[PDB]
A paper describes a structure:
[name] is one of the most significant parasites that impacts human health, with estimates that as many as one third to one half of the human population are infected. At the Center for Structural Genomics of Infectious Diseases ([name]), the first Toxoplasma Structural Genomics Pipeline was established. The enzymes selected from the TDR database as small and tractable for expression and crystallization included: phosphoglycerate mutase II (hereafter referred to as PGM), nucleotide diphosphate kinase (NDK), ribulose phosphate 3-epimerase ([name]), ribose-5-phosphate isomerase (RPI), and ornithine aminotransferase (OAT). The genes encoding these enzymes were cloned, proteins expressed and purified, crystallized, and crystal structures were determined.
Numbering used by the authors:
A (entry chain A): 4 to 228
B (entry chain C): 4 to 230
Write the structure that this text describes.
C-alpha cells in the first residue's frame, strides 16, 4: 500500500552548508531529501548540479535522494545524477515536449539504473494532457507542482489538487508527490486529495521541531488512506 | 602595476560544505575565490547559482568573489550575482555572439555596479576576435581557458598560452587570468607567457598546504618578469 513519505527540499537550507542541514533533516527522521536542479532556462534560476549531490552522498551514505530536474534537457542529466547517487529522478513533461514516447523512454532509462522515475507537471499543464503517460507502470511517481516551479516560499495553489484527485482515482497505488507551499496546514487538503509524498521547503527549515512536523504530516497522510 | 593573484576554484571543493572549504582557502591567504557558474547549456555541467554565492557571502564578508559566468545569457545574471556579492564578473565572448558592441555594453553595465568586468574565451575561439574589445578599456581582465570548460581535473592545454602571450604584449597592464589544469608545474609556463591571475581547482584542494602552494605560485609570477 501507499506509504507516507516526507521530503525536505534542501534548496530551502543554508546553501553553503548543505551537508550539515541535510544531516539535521536526516536526524529529524525525514524519508527523502528533495534536491531541486534548476538550469536557468527551464526556470529562471540556477540551483546546483550533480557535484553538489555527489558531495552530499559522500556525507549521507544511506539517505534517499529524490532529484527533481527543472531543466530543459533531462536526458543529459540522467547519467550524471545516477553517478552522483540519486535514488529517484523526476523530470518534467514540459521538458520532453509533452512527447509520450520521449517520456516513456526516459523513464525506462532511469529505471534501468535501479532508480525510481517520476514525471512532473507544472501548474498550467492540465492533467488530461498526460494522456496515457501514467499507464502501465511507466512511472513510479507523479509530481504535481502546487506552486510555479523555480522559487521557494510561494503560496500553495489548492486548485492544483484536482490533478492529484484525478490521478489518485485512476492509479490507486501510484506515489503522488506535491511540491510548493506545503506545511502543517496545507498537508491536510493535499493528503485528502490523495498525495502521499510531501516536499516541504521553507516550512521545514523554519520549523521549531522538524521531527514533530514530519511526524504530523505522515499521520495526516496515514489517516487519509 | 600587475599583482600576482591566486584564486582557488570552489567547484573543486566539497560543494556540500562550501563555506567551510572557502574559509580554509581564505585562511590560507587566497587573493580571490573563483566561482564557476555553469547552466548546463553553455557548458555541459551545472555547478551552482546566485543563492549559493549569496549564502557564501554571508559567511565570508571580506573575501573577493570572482564570478565566472559559463552561461548562455550572461545579461540575465548580472544583477543576481551583484546582489549575491560579486566583486568581479567574467562573461564569455561566445555567450554574447562574439559581438563587440554587446560585449562592451555588458562590461559597462557590470562596471556601473562597481564591479570589475572580465572577458573569457574558450579554447576554440581565436584570440584575434577580441582585439578591439580589450582595447576599449571596458574590461578589467581577460580569462583564457586552458581546458575545455565544464569540468575540473582536465589536462592543461599549453597551446592556449599563445593567446596569453599575445594579450600580454598588447595590454601590458591588463590582468590576464588562466583557468583549467593549473598546478605547481603548469603555473610556470603560464606565468612566463604573461598570466598574472591563476585559477587553481583540483591542485589547490588536494594540496597538503594550500597556503604554501599559493605563495609558490605568486613567487613564480613575480619571477616571470610578467610584473
Ligand atoms: Cl532557452
Ligand atoms: Cl544515459
Ligand atoms: Cl604570499
Ligand atoms: Zn522540487
Ligand atoms: Zn572559471
Amino acid at each position: 500500500q501507499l506509504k507516507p513519505i516526507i521530503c525536505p527540499s534542501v534548496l530551502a537550507s543554508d546553501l553553503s552548508s548543505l551537508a550539515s542541514d541535510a544531516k539535521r533533516m536526516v536526524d529529524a527522521g525525514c524519508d527523502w531529501l528533495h534536491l531541486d536542479i534548476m538550469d536557468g532556462h527551464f526556470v529562471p534560476n540556477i540551483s546546483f548540479g550533480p557535484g553538489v549531490v555527489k558531495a552530499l552522498r559522500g556525507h549521507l551514505k544511506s539517505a534517499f535522494f529524490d532529484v527533481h530536474l527543472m531543466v530543459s534537457e533531462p536526458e543529459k542529466w540522467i547519467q550524471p545524477f545516477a553517478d552522483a547517487g540519486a535514488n529517484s529522478i523526476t523530470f518534467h513533461w514540459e521538458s520532453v515536449g509533452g512527447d509520450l514516447q520521449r517520456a516513456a523512454e526516459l523513464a525506462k532509462r532511469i529505471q534501468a539504473r535501479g532508480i525510481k522515475a517520476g514525471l512532473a507537471i507544472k501548474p498550467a499543464t492540465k492533467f488530461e494532457d498526460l494522456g496515457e503517460a501514467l499507464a502501465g507502470d511507466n512511472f513510479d511517481m507523479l509530481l504535481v507542482m502546487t506552486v510555479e516551479p523555480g522559487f521557494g516560499g510561494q503560496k500553495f495553489m489548492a486548485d492544483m489538487l484536482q490533478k492529484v484527485r484525478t490521478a489518485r482515482s485512476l492509479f490507486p497505488k501510484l506515489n503522488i508527490q506535491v511540491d510548493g507551499g506545503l506545511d502543517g496546514e496545507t498537508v491536510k487538503p493535499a493528503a485528502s486529495a490523495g498525495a502521499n509524498v510531501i516536499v516541504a521547503g521553507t516550512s521545514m527549515f523554519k520549523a521549531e521541531n522538524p521531527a514533530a512536523l514530519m511526524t504530523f504530516m505522515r499521520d495526516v497522510i496515514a489517516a487519509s488512506d
